Structures are given as structure tokens and as C-alpha cells.
């Protein structure tokens, strides 16, 4: 797929099966037919792995195809919990967390969250977020017949905790 000869056939062959390694390699060529075909594919199946690879491939040079796909998917799937950063469920405020405001909801700017769910303008501001507070992260906790407690009293003052 270094030349535009297989573009016409692969346009349909990859709608048939988008997760194909050959279709993904066709998309790595980063030509307009491939990116538009996958923008159409992912505007319906943005919750599939090949859409993660698609968003990885296009950004940052051709983020527009992924942004249009995300817009379509998250206006169709209003109830998907993964579209609540790009399309906030509040009726009059869907653009609540667009742009640098993505940092104002710390579950959107997360390392456990796939960045196909954020617009590119949200994704580029995810590295400028300024956070103050006391966060505890545990990668895993396998506890058997053992009670555990994870408390983070963030105040500098020594509270009157009873």
C-alpha cells in the first residue's frame, strides 16, 4: 500500500473487516481515502480497538478525521459513559469541558482513559493540567482475609478527627 492502486478495493474490503492487519496497514499509508474510510467506520464503531489504532495513527497530523468520527459517534450515543467528556450529558452544556476546560474534570484527563474519547483540542491540553490535592493510586490490591484502609486527609491542618 505504498501506491494508490489498491485504494478503491480496500475502501470496501476494510468496511467489511476494519480490524484486519492489512486494512490497518493500508491506513498507515495515511492517504485521504484510508482516513476517510476509517472516519466513516469509527463514526459507528468508535468503541472498538481498531478505532483506538486509527486515532493513534491519524493524530496529530490528521486529527480532523478522528474528531469528526468522535462527534458523530457521541451525538448518536448520548448515553455512552465514554462520550461524557466530549458530549457532556447536561442538556444545555455539552461543550462544558471542551478545550482547556478538559482539565476541570479530572476523570477526563486520566492516564487510564483512552484518548480516542477526547477531541484533539482536549487532548493537547491534557498535559498542561495543574492539579493540587492528595491522590493515592494503587495499581492492584489482592487482599485475602485482610481488611484494608486507604485514607488521604489532604488538609495541612491537623483536623479534630474523632
Amino acid at each position: 500500500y505504498k501506491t494508490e492502486h489498491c485504494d478503491d478495493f480496500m475502501t470496501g474490503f476494510c468496511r467489511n473487516d476494519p480490524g484486519n492487519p492489512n486494512c490497518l496497514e493500508w491506513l498507515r499509508a495515511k492517504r485521504k481515502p484510508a482516513m476517510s474510510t476509517y472516519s466513516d467506520i469509527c463514526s459507528k464503531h468508535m468503541d472498538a480497538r481498531y478505532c483506538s489504532e486509527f486515532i493513534r495513527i491519524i493524530r496529530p497530523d490528521y486529527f480532523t478525521f478522528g474528531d469528526t468520527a468522535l462527534y458523530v459517534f457521541c451525538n448518536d450515543h448520548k448515553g455512552n459513559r465514554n462520550c461524557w467528556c466530549a458530549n457532556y450529558p447536561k442538556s444545555n452544556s455539552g461543550d462544558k469541558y471542551l478545550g482547556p476546560r478538559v482539565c476541570w474534570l479530572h476523570e477526563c484527563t486520566d492516564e487510564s482513559r483512552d484518548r480516542k474519547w477526547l477531541y484533539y483540542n482536549q487532548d493537547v491540553q491534557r498535559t498542561r493540567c495543574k492539579y493540587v490535592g492528595c491522590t493515592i493510586n494503587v495499581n492492584s490490591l489482592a487482599l485475602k482475609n485482610s481488611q484494608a484502609e486507604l485514607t488521604s486527609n489532604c488538609t495541612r491542618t491537623t483536623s479534630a478527627v474523632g
Binding site: K32, F65, T68, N121, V124, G133, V138, S140, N145, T151
Partner: protein
């Protein structure tokens, strides 16, 4: 094409018609998509992808460069005329995404070239009232961080300084999270942030 009709399928009597590979990159789609993306014929996907690809255009040919310069001039004129239209909202969004100094200057030019009604309807954050400005000095954190106007404003209509200040906010976040948990019958787990 056959019988004056365009199709994607082949049948006997049809006539093939092919157009240039990466026809958009060559700048041959600039005029047609420019006067096709305004009005009831605006297709969000194709118009947005045309703008986005225009901002990342290969400059192999001089004619393509001239077409891109003409396209930016035409879009700047149209959006200085009125920036509420979907195509100018797309233009401002992609100018912001470009993140160069020239694109930021262009955003400021278009936004401050608007009319009074647009400024009062969409750019209340960029033009705070006297009361808000006087009450802003009482705080140390930027006005855009706590201003109710800037908490639901359209980000495309924020001036560059207000956009950056909206970025520079300290957000109080604490969380006690366990990514993976294997808790059996006789055991418990507790989480808190004060």
C-alpha cells in the same frame, strides 16, 4: 457516468471518469468546497475534513501554495464578516489547533473584528464587565477560572489570552483509586479523601 447519471457501480454503456489523486492537496477543491460549505449545503464531515487537511497541506507545487494562500485570505474575510457560521467556527477551531503565533494572531483579529451583538452574545468572557473586573482583583486565581461566563463560553470565541488563562487553573483533585482489586469473602477495603 451514463445517461447523465453518476454512479459508483459498473454497468455496460457506462463511461469512466477519474479525478486527480489527492485532488484536495492539489488545491483543486478549494473554490468548490469553499462556496459549497456555506449555507444549507454545509456538510459538517466533509467541510471539517477539508479545513483540517487544508491546515496540513503539502506544498509541493507553487499553484497549491497560491490556492492555499487565497483560501486563507477568503476565509479570513468571510469570518471577519461573521464568525457565528459553522464554517467559521470550524476555521477558528482549526486555527486554535494549529497553535502557531500567526494562527493565534488571526484568531484575535477575526474575534475582535466582530460586531457588538456578537461580542455581547458569544464573547462575554473576553469582555468582562466593570463589576467583574473590579471583583477579580479580590482573587489571585485568574478570572477565567471562576467566572460563570467562562464556564460555559464557546472556546472557539475566546481570545488567545483568555484561552491560555482558562488553561492555567489549579484544580483541587484528590482520589484514592485501586485500578485492580481482588477482594475475597472475608475482607474489606475503605477509601477516603478527608
Amino acid at each position: 457516468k451514463k445517461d447523465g447519471k453518476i454512479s459508483d457501480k459498473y454497468e455496460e454503456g457506462a463511461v469512466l471518469e477519474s479525478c486527480w489523486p489527492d485532488v484536495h492537496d492539489t488545491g483543486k477543491c478549494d473554490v468548490d468546497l469553499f462556496d459549497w460549505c456555506q449555507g444549507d449545503t454545509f456538510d459538517r464531515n466533509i467541510c471539517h475534513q477539508w479545513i483540517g487537511s487544508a491546515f496540513n497541506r503539502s506544498n509541493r507545487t507553487v499553484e497549491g501554495q497560491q490556492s492555499l494562500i487565497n483560501l486563507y485570505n477568503k476565509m479570513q474575510t468571510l469570518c471577519s464578516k461573521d464568525a457565528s457560521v459553522p464554517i467559521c467556527e470550524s476555521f477558528l477551531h482549526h486555527l486554535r489547533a494549529h497553535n502557531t503565533e500567526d494562527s493565534k494572531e488571526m484568531i484575535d483579529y477575526i474575534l475582535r473584528q466582530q460586531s457588538a451583538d456578537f461580542k455581547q452574545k458569544y464573547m462575554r468572557c473576553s469582555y468582562p464587565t466593570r463589576d467583574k473586573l473590579e471583583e477579580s482583583l479580590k482573587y489571585a486565581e485568574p478570572r477565567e477560572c471562576w467566572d460563570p461566563e467562562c464556564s460555559n463560553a464557546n472556546v472557539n470565541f475566546l481570545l488567545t489570552r483568555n484561552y491560555n488563562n482558562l488553561g492555567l487553573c489549579n484544580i483541587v483533585r484528590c482520589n484514592t483509586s485501586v485500578n485492580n482489586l481482588q477482594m475475597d469473602k472475608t475482607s474489606s477495603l475503605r477509601l477516603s479523601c478527608g
